[PDB]
Amino acid sequence: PMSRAYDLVVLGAGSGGLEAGWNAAVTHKKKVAVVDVQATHGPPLFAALGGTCVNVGCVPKKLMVTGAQYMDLIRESGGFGWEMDRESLCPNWKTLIAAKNKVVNSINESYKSMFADTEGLSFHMGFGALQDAHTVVVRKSEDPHSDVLETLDTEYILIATGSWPTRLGVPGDEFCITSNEAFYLEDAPKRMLCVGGGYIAVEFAGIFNGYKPCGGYVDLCYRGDLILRGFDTEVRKSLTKQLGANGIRVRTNLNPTKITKNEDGSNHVHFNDGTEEDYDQVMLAIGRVPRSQALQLDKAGVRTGKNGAVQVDAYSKTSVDNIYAIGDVTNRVMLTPVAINEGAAFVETVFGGKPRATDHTKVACAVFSIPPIGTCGMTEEEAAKNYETVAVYASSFTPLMHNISGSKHKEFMIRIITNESNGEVLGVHMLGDSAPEIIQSVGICMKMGAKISDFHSTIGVHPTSAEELCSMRTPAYFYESGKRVEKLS
């Protein structure tokens, strides 16, 4: 049947969008249109071809986290007998950004190669918006009276417009920055305030701390008692302690009430406790909400809810049968590899014939803090709620190399959460160098329903930090009927 210009229009050329578009085009010879707002990373729109991850997320972030680590690694080299002037050690921030821009730019460039070279896959630059269930309009600007560039007549629509940082909404909010603006800063700031206690706040605290000029400092300021909500409690306390030792002042039960601009350019910040303080820059990392607010979803009749989240079934389908939505715009787990899996499972479902729903349980993630976190599965707090009897295995050690490096604060931590019944591993929570690498392969065991038996029965790899997974036999303590107990009934 030769009806409609495109089989599939994809709003958002990000992690979810491109996977879907590319699969649909090459493996199922479908005609696929992919809409995004710019082809290259940067202000004023930030996101681009490749999406948030490539342009202003996972990729550039980890490049910069890697950069800031050299501060620690250079300190540490001295114990191993690397004499070299430590007074001459101020990192050049401009050289880092240049390098990071070069790398992101080459990815954007390799995505233009993809489109020109791949048959039946076209890229449409502007602002997508629905008109009906079968029509997506592309505009110059997001202002819905902007000149219309293209009207894409399509059989299926896939909404993959991702998410956008949330603002603080107080007198002074417009003088603060976010992840987006942080990546283009001309100079590393001397006096830096990271507002928030989520993984972005923490990762960027670590970056700024590494790239701070001589005499500078980083405060991390959080609404609540303990940073990294929904992470292992003892891992969060240990990281709080290690950010401290690395020179990051963590402040809790603290919220800016007001920001005003000083004469030199810096920002005055009033807080809850009465305290006033001056910062060269103030970065809000207080959450990310879906971008559905300009897609005019009301017009097509696709179902919205909790903060513009696209209401979606297991197979990613909206209220309208031909319109699907994946990634951060759905407001489930906001990770790149999830969106990629949802997009892959969308093409298999609709165009493959072979239906599949993404599996959201025990998906491993990481925090690229200094030091880093690797986690997969559930905290002991939620295990003790959903499970009769729960064993908590726990082990903390300092790798011998830190007796030499001077970094004696760098406790490596592993906690495993069990179902007593059958030994099943419900959660693994690691803090320390290499954790994100180790957890990936933990995530495979946990997928295969690994019991604690399966860990301690594995011959170890010496000397390693991971070999301590296979040395955890005796539980530290338990939970029967969701209350902590010294020992088991």
Ligand X SMILES: Cc1cc2nc3c(=O)[nH]c(=O)nc-3n(C[C@H](O)[C@H](O)[C@H](O)COP(=O)(O)OP(=O)(O)OC[C@H]3O[C@@H](n4cnc5c(N)ncnc54)[C@H](O)[C@@H]3O)c2cc1C
Ligand Y SMILES: NCCCCc1cn(-c2ccc(-c3nc(CCc4ccccc4)cs3)c(OCCC3CCNCC3)c2)nn1
Q: 38-57: which residues touch ligand X (CB under 6 A)?
A: 47-48, 51-53, 57
The only residue of 85, 87, 119, 186 in contact with ligand Y, by rule CB under 6 A = 119
From the list a copy of itself, ligand Y, ligand X, none, partner contacted by residue 12 (C-beta under 5 to 8 A by kind): ligand X
Is residue 434 helix, strand or coil? Answer: coil
CA 128 to CA 422: how far, in whole Å? 50
Q: By the 8 A CB rule, do 135 and 148 touch? A: no
Residue 198 annotated as lining a ligand binding site: yes
Angle (CA) 373-374-376 rounded to 5° is 135
Residue 162 annotated as lining a ligand binding site: yes
Q: Is 280 in the site for ligand X (CB under 6 A)?
A: no
From the list ligand X, a copy of itself, ligand Y, none, partner contacted by residue 328 (C-beta under 5 to 8 A by kind): ligand X
The only residue of 87, 117, 174, 186 in contact with ligand Y, by rule CB under 6 A = 117
Residues 6+ apart with CB under 8 A from 323: 130, 133, 156, 157, 158, 159, 300, 302, 317
Cβ nearer to ligand X, comparing 137 with 452 = 137
The closest of 180, 156, 148, 183 to 167, measured between CA atoms, is 180
From the list a copy of itself, ligand X, ligand Y, none, partner contacted by residue 113 (C-beta under 5 to 8 A by kind): ligand Y
Binding mask 339-358 for ligand X (x = CB under 6 A): x-------------------
From the list a copy of itself, ligand Y, ligand X, none, partner contacted by residue 22 (C-beta under 5 to 8 A by kind): ligand Y
From the list ligand X, ligand Y, a copy of itself, none, partner contacted by residue 469 (C-beta under 5 to 8 A by kind): a copy of itself
Which among 41, 124, 409, 462 is annotated as catalytic? 462
Kindly indicate which of the ranges 240-248, 335-343, 355-363, 481-489 contains the residues binding ligand X, using the contact rule CB under 6 A.
Answer: 335-343
Residue 451 annotated as lining a ligand binding site: no
Q: Is 441 in the site for ligand Y (CB under 6 A)?
A: no
Is residue 193 helix, strand or coil? Answer: strand
Backbone angles phi, psi at 121, to 5 degrees: -120, 105
Q: By the 8 A CB rule, do 47 and 13 touch? A: no
Binding mask 76-115 for ligand X (x = CB under 6 A): ----------------------------------------
Q: By the 8 A CB rule, do 195 and 221 touch? A: yes
Q: Is 22 in the site for ligand Y (CB under 6 A)?
A: yes
**Residue-wise DSSP of 247-297:** TEEEE-S--EEEEEE-SSS-EEEEETTS-EEEESEEEE-S-EEES-TTTTH
Spell out a b/e string for 47-66, using b for 16 or more CB atoms within 10 Å of the CB, else e: bbbbbbbbbbbbbbbebbbe
Q: Is 106 in the site for ligand Y (CB under 6 A)?
A: yes
Is residue 457 helix, strand or coil? Answer: coil
Neighbours of 488 (CB within 10 A): 12
Region label for 121, one of left (φ > 0), alpha (ψ between -120 and 50) or beta (otherwise) = beta
Residue 255 annotated as lining a ligand binding site: yes
28 belongs to the catalytic site: no
Residue numbers at the binding site for ligand Y (CB under 6 A): 18-19, 22, 26, 106-107, 110, 113-114, 117-119, 400
Extract the annotated binding site: 15-17, 36, 48, 52-53, 58, 61-62, 128, 161-163, 196-203, 222-223, 229, 255, 287, 328, 334, 336, 366, 462
Enzyme catalytic residues: 462
Residue numbers at the binding site for ligand X (CB under 6 A): 11-17, 35-37, 47-48, 51-53, 57-58, 61, 127-128, 160-162, 179, 200, 291, 294-295, 327-329, 334-337, 339, 462
